[PDB]
């Protein structure tokens, strides 16, 4: 009977409308291995035509008009639930298929204020408290999360719902692992990182939870449950496993091997390639985990899985972007990859800075086009508003700090490729410069991340004003005679001035003048800092400054050379240069018996050599001593030479002018061409090719 | 040189040991320069005597790192960048970066 | 008490001498997660319990106070540790070098020794276990299944649970083997083998499907006595459908770590990740092979070993080619790199397919890798060749064993390129490759390619030339029939053994081809054509006698005479044939424009005609009287009209040195070539595009 | 534009009877007195054999596709199926290599 088709599908799939999202690849268990649903809809057979008839009813409204009211309701529920998932039709009748991901979860979009408002709202039912517990776990409030999860587990049996019971057990176990590792890391390592001992959860909480969680295996939870639930919800069976997220990793490894082999061979895939499968599986797993309110922030494994999937997709897209073709290939080849809001959020949340740097090394994300930029701007503005609101007051959630600062850093690092508006850029810059913690971003990292944000947004007046206030605050911080900033990059406060001058060459600060015009010889550690920022003030203030302080030290000399104060060199400067280069050797010949290599990071001597090659400094006494460093075989005797001093890295370290002059010499050119051919042949790097194609022939 | 070194962590106020570990990974990435030195060590035991909200403030300490392998490597200014990641299997990796002040520029020293 | 230390280790490890090899990473379960043994020995804590025992090892005075039973326990424990590889503690660790040694006849492929061992009389139950494994390896599957069933039957009576459980697992996996074998033999076996070959009869399958119903791999551990559950927890992971999964995840994590370190350019200290990968691979290999487990039936084990070896080769290539500053040169000056040994050669031969080896050659450079223990490799290759010639010289072949063995034989003969062989071994290998290898697996082109790649380090002595002479005589006799035609998948035909011979023996004639050439007639076609391929291999009198019968009246004969050097200077009425061909091509071309037939054939006559045009040998005006619409002739009729491209981007690598050098000697297309070459070298990674950029173009 | 999903027909030469039908999955092409060096490897998807056919030799392969008729002809092909028994399990893929006879050196034809 044609009216009897929906009895079987309902009798096998009825339990599955108790969830919010199920996986297409996870539908195999509910039908007990009768058909196979591909990751993009289409069903494939694997003794009565069972799934064909139902989809036949969909394309013919006449045939389904003979059903009764109950049958029509069953058909409507099944059709709506299929539409919610993505099951469409059979493969033999498949056509054009485009799949878009849409995750309906407040946690994914980071609506912290909305989550707080929803938590403050009154309770309604058990699922509302399930979502409330998830939102409290996300928001860093962990004790209330644990208590709510325990109460949900307590009352789920009385409310006669088993899925809530099982999922709440799993969530409470995973959050228990979360607090356990949190206190373990806060005790033995937070002393040195945070510079304090911070133990939020008291002894009573841990004492209770360790006793409660003893002999609580993740496995056997499915077996230790009613057999009717065993038959009805087999699809959840794979959740109860210690070695979780393992099949996805194996399938990802196999697909990665297939994609890499196809990249090596240069083959042409047809239809649904392996990368499309990877993307669909990643989106399916993401939607399944997030829409079901499952605690998987506590996993480095999910982060690893998403990282690997996204990196493979980016590498594949780069391969199709840079590849050759043929005439046969054109007869087959004849669909580019571009980044959207969801991909941006995935990369921001699941990647670390090292992973993004590796991606930038291997791939070229500049050539990738970014869409839906309004949503990305909204997301970034929300992140900046959250950080400034939280760090502008006398409060912070340290656990939420550890779970949120990494994502904030990654989002602000990846905002380089996204074009923003004036107000959003101003808010982001203000929150980055005035309220971001100093233990995560030092002055050098702060400057690098600010500078990379001007690649597509330029520098309007508001950003310049914000930088002006930041510089004034730094100047006030330098009032104390026991302050000194340290940078992990070599970029210090004397780089906001250069960045400002690169866009607003004519510019003076109205606030730095007063602190400059209120100085005295005893106000040291402020005159030194203001010497960094000389080109930023008025000429009268400049002269008033350079009165107090002379050039009597080498650091001041190179500073004045750097800020353009000294264009033409002056006498008694080679005096200081020769004094330094003589004291270095005076210490050298006493340490030869001691045997100290002392390869310091100081770059004064190589800079002196570079100055020598430009003939600005030229004198016989310069080569009187020669120090330990090997770099004087360049600018003191290009004929003596050695294996190498540090040339192989310095061709990429140097600038255009010095490389061009290098091409204009006598004998070392052939050695340079030999080493460059060796590097380009036995390596893969664009820089060694650019200096081989542009400055050398 | 021997392939295994020893790492000593000290504080820049008393020269007091903080912990001792074994090295795992070392990454090294007018004129100017821009370079970074990231060091990653393995299972470390903290000193038995040193063990006895968040505000955007830099009222922290300074630390030194010594590599022993005689070959001596000195990092006078270091900053530990501890990252928080909870794992599935439940049952110590330490990272730090070399710093440098703006007037006594020095990021790595080698003694033979 | 110091004498009480060994009571606990024996009381927890006593069962584990019932096996032949256990994994160090699998020792965690026997001690119930007390310490952790690193993959290369050393133990780490996680009452000093093995610390005291390892202290007794370095002090014979302290262990002299034990009784006879205690001394026996200590000797057994020390010998078993020495057999495995557990050495000492990490805090007391020192210089550690690990060498793999698998003691298995199956691994080394001693088929004759395995047959002799099977024919020998039985002794015990373990001997029949090894016998069943050897029969499964040797392609005799029915007797293997029967022996496994009998072992399972009598294991309970013999009271050895480990044999019972392992025999259950082996019988299940071999049951899967026969099931998939018959499934693949029925469908797609008709087209490949050109026959329907069904070795196992209906009775066998009817029995085994009934016996194997409701036999899950899982739950086997639980359905056994709890004493076995406690004693042999280390085997618990064998009973799992999703087997070899944890190793795959660990390999993926280590691969990610290694790739990240390659990208950053970091310097790992001590035991790096690649060392862990190598040691884990060796441990798993030894565990599976030494315990006589049926894992030939898995593509997953092959995938695991393939991935491990490929990662190791890529890492070795990186450290060989990496850019090094002062620090790397100081710490690794002597370059204690990675080199290939006999075990690695056997692993690559057995577990890799030809496509995987070609991908390895594309990505890496195995020529720069040094190969050691070449005597064992020569012995292995000689054994493979002897087996293939013995099997295919008589009227017999085990087709199942053929399917399990021919792939490894092909891979071994393909990878023998990098190994230096002796004269006798090379002669045996060449004879077995040319006279007895099946034609359905290696056609004439693949045969020639694999023979040619074997002369990279062995040159070509006289015996190999004689063997090739007999092969050519046999081919000539095969061409007697007027319904024979050889097909090649590479474009290399029988007229390439002659060129290979002449490259080493420029002065050489064949004493046997003359008689078949001097016994020809005008009606003996399909042999004159073949002998025209091989003309430079005969005597001068035979050459003239052969050219008496056949003229140059066809284009194929023309290009053949050009190829074998018969015609050095061109002759009249040759441009006649060229003009006729290129006129008929256009005559068919303008009738198909309305029909719209694109007709890219694989024929390369017209591009070759253009190449001949640029050397002025064929210079005329009637050649440009027509165009076949082919893009390739815009090079040699009008270098100024041009297009996007004809096929230049692949033809810079397809051409030879002379034509590229002449390309550098022209007027206008040089700048277009330099633009496309800069684009290719910038937005790609290929050595060839760099060589044409560094050598012929500046 | 090409649909990027063609249909492959495998038939027997010397007779013409259709052997089976399949869906294209992968196509790989590798490359004075010049010479040719190129190979064509084809991999197809789940295929069912002809009912009449189930109850040396030469074979032909035809690829059918449309760009919005586009035909690809391989006159001489050789199957290269390999036996690989695997875990789990209970349609597989079939691999072809393009051949070329020595008289007419043609291994691939395209019709628009």
Residue numbers in the entry:
A (entry chain C): 304 to 349, 353 to 640, 643 to 1005
B (entry chain D): 5 to 33, 52 to 74, 161 to 177, 190 to 211, 216 to 236
C (entry chain B): 304 to 349, 354 to 1005
D (entry chain A): 4 to 34, 51 to 74, 168 to 180, 190 to 211, 215 to 236
Give passages from the manuscript.
The NADase activity of DSR2 is unleashed by recognizing the phage tail tube protein (TTP). DSR2 is arranged as a dimer of dimers, which is facilitated by the tetramerization of SIR2 domains. DSR2 has a two-domain architecture, with the CTD responsible for sensing the infection signal and SIR2 acting to prevent phage propagation.
An elongated DSR2 tetramer binds four TTP molecules (termed state 1), each of which is nestled into a pocket primarily formed by H2-H4 subdomains and an additional H3 subdomain from the neighboring molecule. In addition, a loop segment (aa 493–504) of H2 transits into an α-helix in the presence of TTP. This α-helix of H2 subdomain fits snuggly into a pocket between the two slices of BS1, forming multiple hydrophobic contacts via Leu495, Leu497 and Leu498. Mutation of the residues in the lid region responsible for inter-dimer association (Y71A/I90A and replacement of aa 78–96 with a GSAGSA linker) abrogated the NADase function of DSR2 in the presence of TTP, indicating that the lid region may modulate the catalytic activity of SIR2 domain. Together, it is reasonable to conclude that the TTP binding stimulates the rearrangement of the lid region, thereby activating the NADase function of the SIR2 domain.
